[PDB]
Amino acid sequence: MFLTRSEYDRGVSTFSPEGRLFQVEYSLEAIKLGSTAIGIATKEGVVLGVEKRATSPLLESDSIEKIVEIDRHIGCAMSGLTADARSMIEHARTAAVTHNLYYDEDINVESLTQSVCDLALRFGEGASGEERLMSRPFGVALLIAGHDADDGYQLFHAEPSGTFYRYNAKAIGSGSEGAQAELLNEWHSSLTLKEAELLVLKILKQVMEEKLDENNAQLSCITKQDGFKIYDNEKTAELIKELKEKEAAE
Amino acid sequence: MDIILGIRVQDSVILASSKAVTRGISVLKDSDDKTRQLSPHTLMSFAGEAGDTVQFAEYIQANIQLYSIREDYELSPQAVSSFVRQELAKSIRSRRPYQVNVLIGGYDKKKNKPELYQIDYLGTKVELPYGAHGYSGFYTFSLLDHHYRPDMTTEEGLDLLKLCVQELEKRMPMDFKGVIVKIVDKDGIRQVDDFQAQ
Amino acid sequence: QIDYALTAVKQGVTSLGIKATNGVVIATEKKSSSPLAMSETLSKVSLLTPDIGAVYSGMGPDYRVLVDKSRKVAHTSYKRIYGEYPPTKLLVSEVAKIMQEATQSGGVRPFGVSLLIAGHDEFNGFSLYQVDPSGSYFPWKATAIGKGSVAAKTFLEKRWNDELELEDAIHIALLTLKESVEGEFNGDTIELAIIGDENPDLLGYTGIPTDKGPRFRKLTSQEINDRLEAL
């Protein structure tokens, strides 16, 4: 064993000799160390699943809200400090209604996402030019998924750093490095919602190294027609039962 | 205005309050409880400006239900009074002044006596055997002067109250569409819903 | 950190105060930072109200800006409300509050001075107070502060009785200051003030018999030399 250490570790909002901002490079590793969360996009809807991880029969699951509505057409899933994202969501719900008021239309998923990033982009304790009023990078990553009529169904990864990518299917949290390399294998431009409802489970089964039920998984989706609904425990189960069978195929 | 009455007897306090809400040309409601309960044994009737009226009485309701809940003690009438007063006196040199007149009546559980307080939109506060705001006082104060004893049973005092309302329906130009009479005593705040024909 | 300021006070020229039955007395020495300097241009014993004076030990400047801030607080917080001047006890309170805030405030060091404030208010009579950098303040029959602090404080216990006439306390506070003196010892290097009888001579006007003039009198270069000969 042995110890590697740079002299510019630690440094808060100051550049390493490379141009790296280690305070924020680390902000980004702690997504890899929270609850699992997975999003997949079809041409027939978008699916978001997470890991519940109930720690008792008492604690009635469902106070475990790791997937929440934003407007009827935009949902997001979160991995990490669920408590630290209360404010991040308030701002997104507030921005989406505010847009609906000022303009009489549902707000573009691309721009709803960018607005949330523009919020965690106010990290600091000393800014001249424009003021960024807050204290620390926002300690939570987001999968934001919804539908507008310009650019079909969409999936987005909002990072604490204030930037984002639009993945066609993404995984974040404890299993991500592995779940991600599995989605990268099993995703095609022609999935059906039924097919992806299930692939999200198969990949939660894998990177949880366990057998799963409605006490440890929550499924949700967002269709053009029905909006953004979160599957109640019954539906999540005969979706699970439906995999126990599909994989007993060969 | 807008009829706000009240008489303190031996064992309780009684508040009358016109039932009518008028918006210029039409009478909009024939059944308005013009009073908020400030706590188990303390009642406040009120009349005056349009919106200013309710919004004030509810602010006081909140602030007294909060002192009640916090010290788990039922704030005494004298105090609820002298607080409501200050809150009006504060708003009189304010930007837009609460324009509200009130009658506060309640049972002091510690002196076991009834108390009636009269406060006008200016913060003018005085304690009385009987009281009224608006013009209500002119037709009725002459009767109370005459027929009031401070040892009056709660029943003896309801009688004297009906007699005032009768005089107001006779010599007063406004159709106020009746009263609601509420009583405050040791047992709290109850409402007599059999009045315009007792 | 308050402790280090009390240390700047422990060095720096000695000063003292003695209360009597009919007056109070405060004095310090005027150490000339040079013979070229005219020592009459700097006053270590300053008037706060015509019934109250003050002396210090320590950092010169910190005393000046404290004497100024102090005079003002006597009007802003008392005279402009009640028409009277403040009583020794309370003006002292308002100075301690001033110094106590330099303590508990960020970005500023406490003052490098201990103050001796002496005065007379109609109801509390005479009184003499000490105020420390800490913002604490204590009432004294007599004391001293600064280098000669210990020698002089011991001499004052030895020589003080509660039957002193003000002239007796002037006499003492001159001896006390004669043993500690660093430079020469005359009227040009001693500053002495008293809080005694009302001085109508010094009012500046005559016509209202209800206000009778300053109790605070700062002895002249002459008055001192005169006492030091018959000493």
Binding site: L58, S63, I64 | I69, R70 | -
Partner: protein, 227 residues
Amino acid sequence: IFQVEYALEAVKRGTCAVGVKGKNCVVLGCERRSTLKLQDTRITPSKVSKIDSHVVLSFSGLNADSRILIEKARVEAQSHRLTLEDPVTVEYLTRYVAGVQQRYTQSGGVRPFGVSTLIAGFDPRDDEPKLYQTEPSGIYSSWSAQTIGRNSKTVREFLEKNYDRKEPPATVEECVKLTVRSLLEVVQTGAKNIEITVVKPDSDIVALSSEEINQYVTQIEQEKQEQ
């Protein structure tokens, strides 16, 4: 930035606190060392704190820290009735309390609270019991029953193996029957150690006294020894 976990420690060390849902009723329970002989008995028995006419709240932690919460809440409880004319819902009162402990970390950089709290009661009109728990982080959770505090783990273990959802303590009386047993495990004398409050549908909150608490302990340890 780690100071959160440290505060969560003070939770541990404090007056032990519990709570238990029922078929239609709810109960809390919690407190500390009888009386140090010479202390005034009748003037701080403020174990569980009333928030509105229908909502209560106990805590494990720094007693001097709770008060700042039991107020900011007692207030938003009115400032909701006032600006929306509608008593606060038990989830909302809870989300507001927790949401405040949360904002005592991530801005300005100030210290977080030394309390976990339990919050019980019935929403307005609705007669479905509600029980929640908060912690210095900003996390709110709903529980069929729970405990937080000192030797709280012994109790959470007890309860898990004594409560079942299939049959919740229906009787008013018996719902307390259980909450007692579960604190007797961790106390340090008995009835004289920890007391209880009880809220039933529609703003009917009736806290229990000393004499009703010993028609219980001394009707428990009867059935006990019977073997």
